[PDB]
Amino acid sequence: KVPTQPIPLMMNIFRDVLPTVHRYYDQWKERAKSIPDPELRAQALDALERKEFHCEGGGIYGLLARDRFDELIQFIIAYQIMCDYLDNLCDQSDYLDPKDFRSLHNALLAALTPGEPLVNYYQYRIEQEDGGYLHELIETCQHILVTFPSFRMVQENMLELSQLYGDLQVHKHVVKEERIPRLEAWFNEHKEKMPEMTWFEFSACTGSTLGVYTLATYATKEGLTSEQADVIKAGYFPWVQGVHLLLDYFIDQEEDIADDELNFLFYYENEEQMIERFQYFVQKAEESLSTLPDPKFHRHIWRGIIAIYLSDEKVQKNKELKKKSKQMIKMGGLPSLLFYLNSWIYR
Amino acid sequence: KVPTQPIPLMMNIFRDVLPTVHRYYDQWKERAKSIPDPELRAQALDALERKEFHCEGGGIYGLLARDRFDELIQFIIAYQIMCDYLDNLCDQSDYLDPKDFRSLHNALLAALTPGEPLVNYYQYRIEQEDGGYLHELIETCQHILVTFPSFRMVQENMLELSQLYGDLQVHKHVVKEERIPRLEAWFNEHKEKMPEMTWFEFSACTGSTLGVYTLATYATKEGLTSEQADVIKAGYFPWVQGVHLLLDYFIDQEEDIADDELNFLFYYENEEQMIERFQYFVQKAEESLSTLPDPKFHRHIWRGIIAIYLSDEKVQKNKELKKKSKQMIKMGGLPSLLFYLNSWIYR
Numbered sequence: 001k002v003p004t005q006p007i008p009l010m011m012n013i014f015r016d017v018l019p020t021v022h023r024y025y026d027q028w029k030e031r032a033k034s035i036p037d038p039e040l041r042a043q044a045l046d047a048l049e050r051k052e053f054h055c056e057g058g059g060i061y062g063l064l065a066r067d068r069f070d071e072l073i074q075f076i077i078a079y080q081i082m083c084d085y086l087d088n089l090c091d092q093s094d095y096l097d098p099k100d101f102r103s104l105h106n107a108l109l110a111a112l113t114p115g116e117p118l119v120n121y122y123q124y125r126i127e128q129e130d131g132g133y134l135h136e137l138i139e140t141c142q143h144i145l146v147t148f149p150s151f152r153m154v155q156e157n158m159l160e161l162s163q164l165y166g167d168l169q170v171h172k173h174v175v176k177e178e179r180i181p182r183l184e185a186w187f188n189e190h191k192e193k194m195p196e197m198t199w200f201e202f203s204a205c206t207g208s209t210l211g212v213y214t215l216a217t218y219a220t221k222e223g224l225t226s227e228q229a230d231v232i233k234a235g236y237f238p239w240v241q242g243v244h245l246l247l248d249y250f251i252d253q254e255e256d257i258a259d260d261e262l263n264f265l266f267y268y269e270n271e272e273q274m275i276e277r278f279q280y281f282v283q284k285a286e287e288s289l290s291t292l293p294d295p296k297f298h299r300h301i302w303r304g305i306i307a308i309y310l311s312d313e314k315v316q317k318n319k320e321l322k323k324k325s326k327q328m329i330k331m332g333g334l335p336s337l338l339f340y341l342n343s344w345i346y347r
Numbered sequence: 348k349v350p351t352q353p354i355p356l357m358m359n360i361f362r363d364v365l366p367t368v369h370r371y372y373d374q375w376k377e378r379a380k381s382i383p384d385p386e387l388r389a390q391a392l393d394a395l396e397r398k399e400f401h402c403e404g405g406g407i408y409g410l411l412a413r414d415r416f417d418e419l420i421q422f423i424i425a426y427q428i429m430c431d432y433l434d435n436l437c438d439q440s441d442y443l444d445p446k447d448f449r450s451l452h453n454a455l456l457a458a459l460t461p462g463e464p465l466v467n468y469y470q471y472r473i474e475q476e477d478g479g480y481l482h483e484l485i486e487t488c489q490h491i492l493v494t495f496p497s498f499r500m501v502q503e504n505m506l507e508l509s510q511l512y513g514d515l516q517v518h519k520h521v522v523k524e525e526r527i528p529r530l531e532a533w534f535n536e537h538k539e540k541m542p543e544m545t546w547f548e549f550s551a552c553t554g555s556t557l558g559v560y561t562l563a564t565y566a567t568k569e570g571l572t573s574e575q576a577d578v579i580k581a582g583y584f585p586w587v588q589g590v591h592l593l594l595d596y597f598i599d600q601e602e603d604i605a606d607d608e609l610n611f612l613f614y615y616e617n618e619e620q621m622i623e624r625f626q627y628f629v630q631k632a633e634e635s636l637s638t639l640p641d642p643k644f645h646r647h648i649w650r651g652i653i654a655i656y657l658s659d660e661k662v663q664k665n666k667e668l669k670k671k672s673k674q675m676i677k678m679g680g681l682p683s684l685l686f687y688l689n690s691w692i693y694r
């Protein structure tokens with residue numbers, strides 16, 4: 001059974017999770033260095049250099065499936081590396097062609113579809129020589145997932161989350177003036193199925209990968225039911241994924257204002273409403289997580305996400321953001337502890 | 348209103364204690380570079396290089412005296428730097444003269460005796476030109492302690508612990524053949540006023556500075572009685588100071604074997620007696636710590652000391668030492684967590 005007490009959970013993270021994450025991550029770093037196209041190489045290495053924490057955090061789900069520990073971390077790391085690589089490629093495109101953004105994100109859907117024939121995901125952009133990097137990442141996922149006893153039961157739900165994540169990456173990276181009309185029209189198709197929320201709250205709920213890793217984790221269990229597959233998707237989507245991205249956008253506010261970049265928090269009528277809605281998402285997230293298997297573990301992961309996000313220098317060394325962050329959620333001083341701990345190690 | 352819950356205690360340590368300690372420690376580092384005698388300078392800078400942990404640890408007592416936070420830490424750092432400097436001078440002496448060791452350790456007594464004129468502490472050795480380094484360490488302690496409203500009530504108890512510490516350093520640093528006779532002779536002078544223990548256990552009890560820092564901490568309070576000063580001293584001496592040094596000697600057994608250093612544990616008649624007496628000291632130490640003001644704070648600092656000591660790779664990588672350590676004290680998974688955390692940070 002998974003560790004649910006702080007000491008053994010932290011001990012297993014430092015002893016087993018991080019060394020195993022970095023064994024697989026460091027191999028992708030070496031592979032990325034050999035990418036022929038200098039722009040694809042730069043974008044790959046940048047994501048690997050800057051977004052290590054996504055794989056390190058993602059790898060913690062390994063603890064729920066000890067008997068498939070290495071395979072599950074390998075899947076999560078390959079999929080998460082792809083997301084951060086493709087985000088860079090869309091972010092740094094001089095061309096802003098949505099066909100390119102869509103074509104690239106179809107790599108994530110292929111990763112979740114064993115035997116899906118691999119295409120030129122780069123077909124709508126000038127840079128196409130990656131020396132097999134993206135293909136290698138896709139096949140890694142395909143060959144691992146097919147070996148999980150209940151992958152077939154969760155596949156449809158993983159594809160649902162991955163398509164929504166892809167649609168977001170397409171709409172939010174097009175030329176500035178076309179973004180919000182695309183996001184509102186897209187939200188409009190799903191708004192009936194969703195709890196009552198705005199286009200920009202919906203946009204945040206689709207932007208996380210946590211549901212995919214959770215569904216892949218339970219795919220390792222014998223005889224997982226379709227009822228359980230749906231419980232597990234509803235555990236993280238929409239509310240936990242929402243809080244995750246609302247936090248990402250909260251921390252990044254000052255640089256989004258400075259670089260006139262799309263920030264979903266900016267479409268709230270005022271900050272009072274943003275704080276109220278953030279607190280609602282947190283309550284609905286607590287309720288959705290409590291429905292999962294291993295509820296105490298999921299509750300630990302989520303509290304960890306919140307504390308780690310709020311421990312950012314961008315929040316903790318900015319008097320107004322820090323004060324606003326405590327209005328949003330009280331974490332018994334954990335964000336601040338992680339900041340000063342971090343500040344102390346790196347000096 | 349002293350923090351005793353783990354998250355805030357740790358946050359204060361990383362935000363307040365460690366940065367304040369390193370501010371003053373760094374000023375002493377720069378001051379030490381101005382020492383004229385090359386050998387005194389090398390020994391002062393080597394102590395400062397290798398022994399920052401003693402100051403970081405000692406500085407945690409600040410949190411019991413927030414009012415005088417900066418002043419108390421300046422006293423603790425000045426005294427501890429003096430201790431580690433004198434320890435280097437006595438260890439690396441080519442002339443092993445107990446007049447020199449005694450004269451040097453008389454600096455600690457001067458540090459605790461404001462308004463009394465200073466000698467040449469180097470009067471019994473070749474190297475004498477330190478440019479006022481040792482006098483400035485003494486003067487720093489004197490100038491802070493006089494400002495403590497209850498210093499006068501604790502000064503006798505502090506000088507008592509400083510005298511025993513000085514005595515130990517004198518006897519343990521002489522030529523190998525005359526150590527145990529001095530230590531046994533010295534213990535026999537004190538045997539009748541001490542609880543039942545060996546000369547080598549007594550030696551362990553006198554070798555810590557925790558009692559001095561704790562008494563200095565309660566000197567910062569108005570209207571401390573003689574009774575309360577005797578309670579505070581008895582809370583650390585002898586049992587807590589004994590556990591602190593016995594644990595140091597336990598961890599360094601292979602080192603002290605290989606470098607042929609004096610190790611008080613080796614004079615137990617067998618391992619089983621060693622473990623049994625260690626367990627007894629722990630019981631008495633738990634008892635004496637529970638008699639203190641802010642007993643939860645003292646318990647936490649003491650369990651932290653122990654967890655940090657036992658987390659040493661010297662213990663965690665050695666099957667036999669790990670086995671014995673878990674017999675000696677029940678710490679749960681904390682030493683192991685600290686080991687894998689340290690292993691991860693310093694990879």
Ligand SMILES: CC(C)=CCC/C(C)=C/CC/C(C)=C/CC[C@H](C)CCOP(=O)(O)OP(=O)(O)O
Nearest residue numbers: 054057058083091207208209248252301304305
């Ligand atoms: C403790 C634990 C389980 C953690 C899991 C964390 C995780 C799996 C995160 C990835 C989930 C994921 C891909 C989140 C989106 C974050 C992404 C960095 C947002 C992109 O915009 P931007 O912020 O501007 O980035 P960039 O342009 O500077 O590169």
Ligand SMILES: CC(C)=CCC/C(C)=C\CC/C(C)=C/CC[C@H](C)CCOP(=O)(O)OP(=O)(O)O
Nearest residue numbers: 400401402404405407430434554555556648652
């Ligand atoms: C509250 C908290 C966390 C306290 C921490 C402890 C402290 C403040 C003082 C140690 C108290 C103290 C002076 C202990 C004895 C020090 C001893 C000489 C160091 C160990 O010996 P060794 O390594 O062999 O010398 P060297 O060869 O490296 O130079």
